[PDB]
């Protein structure tokens, strides 16, 4: 049934695009994790600063 | 078909969902983003208090 | 129709391992949050240490 046909393929894009969604998420959450973690680095050099 | 119909139209209720849920982590991993660059401000300023 | 079936529990599959992953992500980033605000309290515990 083409309308039938269409709206599932209709889904299989917006399914597609939602993968891609994650993807790039996923990859951006891992950046803010390591921008992050640099900034422990820097104020525990600051506190092994202070109490050396 | 009733049924075949039915779970396709479950799958767009589903989906539809999901871009929801992407809409708004998008959103509080961009407010995540921002209160920690606000950190690193902080941070920084602390460095160029001792080393002035 | 066998095939217009195949596609639409071949997409039930893709959505629900979907929700799958933004468990998870719900999840990490809201253990990145946790990370973060007590390095905040580390921060301000500096800031108090030498304005005090």
Same mark, same amino acid.
């Given at each position: 049934?083409?309308?039938?046909?269409?709206?599932?393929?209709?889904? #299989?894009?917006? &399914?597609?695009?939602?993968?891609?969604?994650?993807?790039? @998420?996923?990859?951006?959450?891992?950046?803010?994790? +390591?921008?992050? #973690?640099?900034?422990? #680095?820097?104020? +525990?050099? &600051?506190? #092994?600063? @202070?109490?050396?």
């Amino acid at each position: 049934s083409k309308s039938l046909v269409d709206t599932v393929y209709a889904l #299989k894009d917006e &399914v597609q695009e939602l993968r891609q969604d994650n993807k790039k @998420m996923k990859k951006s959450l891992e950046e803010e994790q +390591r921008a992050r #973690k640099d900034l422990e #680095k820097l104020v +525990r050099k &600051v506190l #092994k600063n @202070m109490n050396d």
